[PDB]
Symmetry: C2
Subunit: 278 residues, 2 copies
């Protein structure tokens, strides 16, 4: 499982049977000129790895160090306050800072709400899951929801990767991920790697061997101007999947820290610039 | 797109590469003896039709006439009360009838919740969709969600087909539905057809040509006792797709009646008996 070949296959598939939206306005516009930027979309795309290798490109450098720090901000710490991420030295989310520096009732908030019952105990979403995975590995009800229909209005923004369903089958743990939308150029490579690590963290606290990693995209897209540098990317030579060292000593999920994560031998291609749009 | 051609494939696969769950217990047990009745699953299975034909079985009789009535009760009526579904001539849900007669804060109740805002107004999941469809076909947030995390503990039961994502591209309404887990034998045929009817309904009241139809399932299971008759279903002869008639006079989504539908020429195979397990 290279992730490059798969990543490539979809990009190349959009450039050939893609669908634009020139015949539509609204939203996006560049920062370079500040006016309309359209896409090329496709529906229902699936990426499934078997955890042979580790989901990461070699044709470009991925901010893996930061991915994990973001992942932890949401899942482990369960925070809606960016001031907490600032302490981790990450300023990517600074743009959505609200009056109180939060993103409202989103992400870390939705993963922290104590709305479920577990033996006469108000528990949050993640906590619940953890327990069910060990005490009831047969359930077809292992799912996490970030798209709370009752709180879409009180959110600074709607999440892309809003859900996941876990599947315990034969001492194995399988994870399926669905994002309503996903910028193939920027966010996807990030998000793929980002969640795999999560699968790995859970599988260590519950002791189930690594299963299948299924990642699905709803509105798979590419910003028009991005195409040219993407074409270059699909011409760059690939590399071997770097071994990814995680601290073996950890027994509890809430005892993890960034220093407990390492990527051994991350050889990659030079660099490529992609204009940001909003 | 016979739906048979694909269905049989999913079945033929669950037989040869299908994971068992004997090792596990809890839940599912027959009635014939009332004890341990487990499955054989496969993960991340997806089906898709170009809508050339209508998705429906020919090797067995699907009680289509009742699929719609159920659908209707939830989307058009948006009710959690079974008595309403009773008056329609259905008693297939009387089992979960709670103390009050409503299956709780599940299904229809969710769709009905006035949680979203639009033009200084409080709207439910359903209406909002209908608005943004014509008032914003480009959006990447067209999502219906029954799986509300805040109310899982308040539902008489959890939905199999819980979410939908509509995509609008080039005057074509596109529908993708997600099923957490499904029983290929009894329940699958029912749910697939049921939602292709839902598409056509919405596709008309807005005014968009019929798009692609995607349907995927997480826990794609089959019961061990059923294997027997299924090995015969696949041997049965297949028929031609019956033309579904919808009243053209309808323009509003709430102006439908069961009589507004009629399945022209539905030739099919004989009968297969599948025992119920809960």
């Amino acid at each position: 499982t290279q992730f490059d070949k798969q990543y490539n296959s979809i990009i190349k598939d959009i450039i050939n049977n893609g669908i634009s939206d020139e015949e539509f306005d609204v939203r996006t516009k560049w920062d370079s000129d500040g006016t309309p930027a359209h896409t090329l979309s496709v529906i229902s795309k699936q990426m499934r790895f078997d955890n042979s290798e580790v989901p990461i490109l070699t044709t470009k450098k991925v901010a893996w160090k930061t991915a994990i720090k973001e992942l932890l901000w949401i899942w482990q710490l369960k925070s809606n306050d960016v001031n907490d991420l600032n302490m981790m030295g990450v300023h990517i989310w600074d743009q959505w800072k609200q009056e109180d520096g939060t993103i409202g009732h989103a992400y870390g908030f939705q993963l922290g709400k104590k709305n479920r019952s577990l033996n006469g105990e108000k528990v949050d979403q993640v906590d619940y899951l953890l327990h069910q995975l060990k005490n009831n590995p047969s359930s077809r009800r292992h799912i996490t929801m970030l798209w709370n229909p009752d709180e879409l209005d009180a959110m600074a923004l709607t999440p892309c990767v809003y859900e996941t369903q876990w599947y315990v089958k034969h001492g194995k743990l399988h994870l399926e991920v669905r994002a309503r939308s996903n910028d193939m150029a920027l966010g996807n490579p990030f998000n793929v790697f980002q969640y795999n690590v999560l699968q790995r963290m859970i599988a260590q606290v519950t002791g189930y061997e690594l299963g299948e990693y299924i990642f699905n995209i709803g509105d798979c897209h590419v910003y028009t101007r991005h195409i040219d540098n993407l074409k270059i990317q699909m011409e760059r030579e690939q590399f071997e999947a770097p071994e990814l060292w995680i601290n073996p000593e950890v027994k509890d999920f809430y005892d993890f820290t960034i220093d407990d994560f390492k990527l051994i031998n991350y050889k990659h291609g030079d660099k490529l610039l992609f204009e940001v749009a909003v």
